[PDB]
Each structure stands twice: as structure tokens, then as C-alpha cells.
């Protein structure tokens, strides 16, 4: 019935501002109330702020009104989020949601909300990094029956890379790890893949790092030493 | 103002299972209670609202209790699309607030991690800043320990560890414990040993090299 969906840009820079706008269907925009929810990396759910659809009337959490504008567009059936000055605290998935409410039983008073839909969410990251490509290293092993190996993609920015193991043909036993940004601003991550020993002086392992933003293709060949 | 706590954060179950998840408030707030169902990469869900009603839709096998500072979410007989992160949240006063979450996982029979160490290429030690990456593969349960040895010494700071979302498969994890050393750091030792703790290994495990070997 109700759909929703954010659009944003990926990336902002420290300082600057965050704008995240919400498209809504198959509803009466103006007749409920609007919703910005966030989860950073690693951190729980945040409510950010909330408004009319009807007169734009906003609220706001505290901890961010210092910062925070929530608008809304009826004819277009659009509300937006703009979050002033920025930082690294901000990176977060930013979802847009519909916000229900009732009577508490007090004189003049409701609740406040929860959210009954909301929409698939926009990752936004803060960071000043500039893009760059990855290097690529091999990481070479073999008593077992299983050896592993793999590929160290160092220093890129910004997310993602893929990895493919000898242009595909290789899938099973794969692990290709989350990134993790290192205090350059820049991410670092390893693919590894567990083979059989025996295979290890036959067969030819390499590993194809692609990275769209910075259009790098590299191919390293993994192999013992 | 009001803070909600959840428990456990985190849950291992199997399919079959009926589980409860816990939720208190720092303090009353009636039966303003509502419970979301959070997977990765996919819009959130309600699925229950004012601490008791089901959200159309949703499943009975789904079921809130309590009011004033205690609640509960129960799962009757566990499916595998319900292992997912579950999140309380008040809404008795403003601001909402969401408690900090329980991501249920799915048990297995312990196994412990399959151990190797890569010395940096010789590539990497030509550029003069090298990698030492210590691999644990294919382990369960998440939780386990590594500690990075240089000539004996315990090197603390420098390392960072990435640990891989559950295996939809085999339900195993795997974890990565990278060392940054400048070359020249790296080249004034000599053993350099990943140590690694875990449930499934009743003796601790080291893998070494001998710096150019």
C-alpha cells in the first residue's frame, strides 16, 4: 500500500551539508506525518525529526535540533532532511518512515510516534577522503589437506571494491571481508579462499580487483613462495 | 529522557526454538511499547504496537507483552526468516528511543577456526610499509580472541580485525586480524606469531614464520 524510498548523495564532506530526501505512494501524503529514522555503522536507531504533511509543522530530537531541517514538498509527496556541519558521527543509513500517533489519556496530550512503514534506507558516509585506488597484495600459504590464500586490497577510497577469484571461475571457500577504515581515511580489506593443498602447485590463483569510483582493474596472481 | 535496555543483545537459536527478548524502561511509559524486525539491507518492519497488538500481516507466532517498565517480544517456534536484529522502542514521550537491539543467529555445533599466517609479500616489503594478516576461518561460536606476538612481545595497537556476517550455509564465521608495521619495524624481528583462543580449541593456537623464510 504505502511505499517509500530515500535517495541521497553517497558522500559528503566534513562540515558541510547532509541532504537525504524521501519519495511516498500510494497515500494521501498530506493527511500523515513524516519520519527520519538513522542507524550509524555499529550504533543503534536514532529518531531524527518528523513533520506534517499537511502544515510542515516539524519536531525535532533534541540532540540534533541545533542542526537539523526537515521540509516537505505535498505536491511532489516528497519530505527532506538537511543536517548542517557534518562529521564522521553522521555516517549512517538514513531511513524515511510514516509516524503514527494517538491520545495518551492526558489533557491535550498524544503520544509521540512509532513508525508503522518505512523505506529500504540510504547509506550516507562523511568523509574528506579523495578517491584512490587500491594496491593489491597477495597473501601466500601446506601440511593440511586445505591451504588457504588470498588477496590483500589495501588503501582505497571510497567503498566499494570487488573481488572475483581467477575472473570467476573460482567462488567456493571464498571470504572477501568487510572493509574497515583505517585512520588514513582509507579502507583496507583481504579476500581469502581455502583450496586443496595438492592443488597449490598446479593450479593458477588470481585474484581481479575492480574499482568503479577510481576506474582501477588489477590482477595479482597468488602463488607460494 | 527515556531510555529502553534490551536483553540479550544478542541470541543463538535454531529453527523450532521459542525465544524471548526482554525490554525495560527507565521508566513507565503505559503500553507505548513497539517492536521492529530489522535484516540486513532491507526496510525495517513493525510488527507489534502498544506492547501487545500485532501489526496486520504479521505472523502469530509474533507476540509483545507487558506494561509500565517490563515487556517482552516472543517468537513461538522459530522460522528461518525470523533470525533477524530486533529492536524495542518507547513512544510514551518525545524523543522515541530504540533499545540497542538483539541480533538472534543461528546455532551450530561448536567448530573451532582453522589458523594461517601471511608474511607480507616481498612486493609489499619493497614498498616499505607491510601487512602481517592473521586468518581464522570457518569457526563457531562469533566469539574468539587473537593476539599478535613479535619476538615474544605483544603488540597492542596497530591491528585491526574484520569478522565476516554469519554464513548462510554452514552458519560458520571468519575473522581477519591485520598488523601494520613500517618495513623497517618489520625487518628489525625476527618471529612474528598470531595466537588465537576459541571455544572449539582446548589449547590456544600459534601460527608463526620466521621473517624470511
Known amino acids: 500500500q504505502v511505499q517509500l524510498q530515500e535517495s541521497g548523495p553517497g558522500l559528503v564532506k566534513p562540515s558541510e551539508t547532509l541532504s537525504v530526501t524521501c519519495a511516498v505512494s500510494?497515500?494521501?501524503?498530506?493527511?500523515?506525518?513524516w519520519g527520519w529514522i538513522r542507524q550509524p555503522p555499529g550504533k543503534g536507531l536514532e529518531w531524527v525529526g518528523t513533520i506534517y504533511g499537511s502544515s510542515g509543522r516539524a519536531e525535532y530530537n533534541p540532540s540534533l535540533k541545533s542542526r537539523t531541517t526537515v521540509s516537505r514538498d505535498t505536491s511532489k509527496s516528497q519530505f527532506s532532511l538537511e543536517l548542517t556541519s557534518v562529521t564522521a558521527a553522521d555516517t549512517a543509513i538514513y531511513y524515511c518512515?510514516?509516524?503514527?500517533?494517538?491520545?495518551?489519556?492526558?489533557?491535550?496530550?498524544?503520544?509521540?510516534?512509532?513508525?508503522?512503514?518505512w523505506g529500504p534506507g540510504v547509506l550516507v558516509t562523511v568523509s574528506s577522503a579523495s578517491t584512490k585506488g587500491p594496491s593489491v597484495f597477495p597473501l601466500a600459504p601446506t601440511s593440511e589437506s586445505t591451504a588457504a590464500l588470498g588477496c590483500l586490497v589495501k588503501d582505497y577510497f571510497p567503498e566499494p571494491v570487488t573481488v572475483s577469484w581467477n575472473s570467476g571461475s573460482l567462488t567456493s571457500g571464498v571470504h572477501t571481508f568487510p572493509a574497515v577504515l583505517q585512520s588514513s581515511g582509507l579502507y583496507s580489506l583481504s579476500s581469502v579462499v581455502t583450496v586443496p593443498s595438492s592443488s597449490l602447485g598446479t593450479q593458477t590463483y588470481v585474484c581481479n580487483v575492480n574499482h568503479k569510483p577510481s576506474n582501477t582493474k588489477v590482477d595479482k596472481r597468488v602463488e607460494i613462495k | 529522557d527515556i531510555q529502553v535496555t534490551q536483553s540479550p543483545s544478542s541470541l543463538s537459536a535454531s529453527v523450532g526454538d521459542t525465544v524471548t527478548i526482554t525490554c525495560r524502561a527507565s521508566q513507565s511509559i503505559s503500553t507505548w511499547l513497539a517492536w521492529y524486525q530489522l535484516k540486513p539491507g532491507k526496510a525495517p518492519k513493525v510488527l507489534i504496537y502498544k506492547a501487545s497488538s500485532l501489526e496486520s500481516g504479521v505472523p502469530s507466532r509474533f507476540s509483545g507483552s507487558g506494561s509500565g517498565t517490563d515487556f517482552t517480544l516472543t517468537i513461538t517456534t522459530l522460522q528461518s526468516e525470523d533470525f533477524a536484529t530486533y529492536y524495542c522502542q518507547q513512544y510514551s514521550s518525545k524523543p522515541p528511543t530504540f533499545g540497542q537491539g538483539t541480533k538472534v543467529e543461528f546455532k551450530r555445533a561448536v567448530a573451532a577456526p582453522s589458523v594461517f599466517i601471511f608474511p607480507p609479500s616481498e612486493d609489499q616489503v619493497k614498498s616499505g610499509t607491510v601487512s602481517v594478516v592473521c586468518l581464522l576461518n570457518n569457526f563457531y561460536p562469533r566469539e574468539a580472541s587473537v593476539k599478535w606476538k613479535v619476538d615474544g612481545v605483544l603488540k597492542t595497537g596497530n591491528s585491526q580485525e574484520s569478522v565476516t556476517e554469519q554464513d548462510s550455509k554452514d552458519n560458520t564465521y571468519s575473522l581477519s586480524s591485520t598488523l601494520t608495521l613500517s618495513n623497517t619495524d618489520y625487518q628489525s624481528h625476527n618471529v612474528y606469531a598470531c595466537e588465537v583462543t576459541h571455544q572449539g580449541l582446548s589449547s590456544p593456537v600459534t601460527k608463526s614464520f620466521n621473517r624470511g623464510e
Open positions: 500510494g497515500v494521501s501524503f498530506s493527511s500523515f506525518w
Open positions: 518512515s510514516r509516524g503514527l500517533f494517538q491520545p495518551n489519556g492526558f489533557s491535550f496530550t498524544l503520544t509521540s510516534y512509532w513508525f508503522d512503514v
